[PDB]
Amino acid sequence: SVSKANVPKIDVSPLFGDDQAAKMRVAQQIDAASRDTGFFYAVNHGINVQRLSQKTKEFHMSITPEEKWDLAIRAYNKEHQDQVRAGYYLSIPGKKAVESFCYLNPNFTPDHPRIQAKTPTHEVNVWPDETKHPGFQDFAEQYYWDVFGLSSALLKGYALALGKEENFFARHFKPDDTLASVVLIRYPYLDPYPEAAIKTAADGTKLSFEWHEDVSLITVLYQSNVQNLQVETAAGYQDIEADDTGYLINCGSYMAHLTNNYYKAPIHRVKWVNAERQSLPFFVNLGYDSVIDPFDPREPNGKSDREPLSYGDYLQNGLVSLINKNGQT
Numbered sequence: 001s002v003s004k005a006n007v008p009k010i011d012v013s014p015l016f017g018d019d020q021a022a023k024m025r026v027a028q029q030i031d032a033a034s035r036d037t038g039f040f041y042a043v044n045h046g047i048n049v050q051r052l053s054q055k056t057k058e059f060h061m062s063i064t065p066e067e068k069w070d071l072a073i074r075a076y077n078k079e080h081q082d083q084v085r086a087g088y089y090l091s092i093p094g095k096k097a098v099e100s101f102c103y104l105n106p107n108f109t110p111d112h113p114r115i116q117a118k119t120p121t122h123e124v125n126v127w128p129d130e131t132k133h134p135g136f137q138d139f140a141e142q143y144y145w146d147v148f149g150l151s152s153a154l155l156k157g158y159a160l161a162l163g164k165e166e167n168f169f170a171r172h173f174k175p176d177d178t179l180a181s182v183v184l185i186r187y188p189y190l191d192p193y194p195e196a197a198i199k200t201a202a203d204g205t206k207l208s209f210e211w212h213e214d215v216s217l218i219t220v221l222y223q224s225n226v227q228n229l230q231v232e233t234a235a236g237y238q239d240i241e242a243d244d245t246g247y248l249i250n251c252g253s254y255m256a257h258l259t260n261n262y263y264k265a266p267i268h269r270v271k272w273v274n275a276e277r278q279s280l281p282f283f284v285n286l287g288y289d290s291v292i293d294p295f296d297p298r299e300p301n302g303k304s305d306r307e308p309l310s311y312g313d314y315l316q317n318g319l320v321s322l323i324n325k326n327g328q329t
């Protein structure tokens, strides 16, 4: 039938410290995972994921249709022309099961210069009413910075894994301008489950979301303990086992570009499972003007012929292409 992917659990705690040899040992494990299936679990990460899951559940379960329209992105509410990324992504009863809420850098305010200039991909977050959802915005903004901190540390591991100084990626990952997003996704239990929400893969597997590479530098994902993800290998798709204490980490296609595909962006898909669950990704994106010169770790000199790609142009094109290929979420 279907085999299981080798997804190692890596203790990332040395990446927060000052023991340089211990950091190299973490980096070696990141390298090995990135060259194998492309996924690993980050453990001993220091984030209170129990509070994350509880607060996210309380939001998803208490928000009403009125509030969802008021928060909806432009795809669901033509009045909200400025909300392409941030806001609520509605389910469609009988047709579309998944819903989610996406928010961006809390530092993007009307006062921010990228907002003043109307630069694409930058938006001001929208939030529910504090009286109906007490503490939610405070929790969500805090969480952004908590997962930002973990992601910064992981980026030091990836830099060391590739033979670079530890700030090689992290220097471009800044609180003032990061395009990183959090998505709070609800996959509901439904009976009957809408057939229109289930896709059939070429190999017959029933899916909630088709194969893709991620639009990110790396993706830092929390999920509740319901198995759903599969990664493509040359010998077919393999199941990724769930772990609701760890963060699942993989590279996105910007990492594949800048390493000349030495660290590939793994192709993965989401199997259909009729179970109430959470999927909480943090997409590690750089700043709009961030450019990293591509290199090829396989070459003594690291020379690559690939063109440098501005992160903002990469992200704008990548988000649109993912909608065109796999559907509006």
Ligand SMILES: CC(C)[C@@H](NC(=O)[C@H](CS)NC(=O)CCC[C@H](N)C(=O)O)C(=O)O
Pocket (backbone or CB within 6 Å): 084, 085, 086, 102, 180, 181, 183, 185, 209, 212, 214, 215, 219, 221, 270, 279, 281, 283, 319, 322, 329
């Ligand atoms: C596999 C998970 C990461 C998750 N998939 C997803 O969230 C999928 C594929 S990675 N991602 C997207 O649609 C991109 C959302 C980008 C976000 N609106 C933004 O503006 O930054 C899932 O559970 O479906």
Ligand SMILES: [Fe+3]
Pocket (backbone or CB within 6 Å): 212, 213, 214, 268
């Ligand atoms: Fe993905």
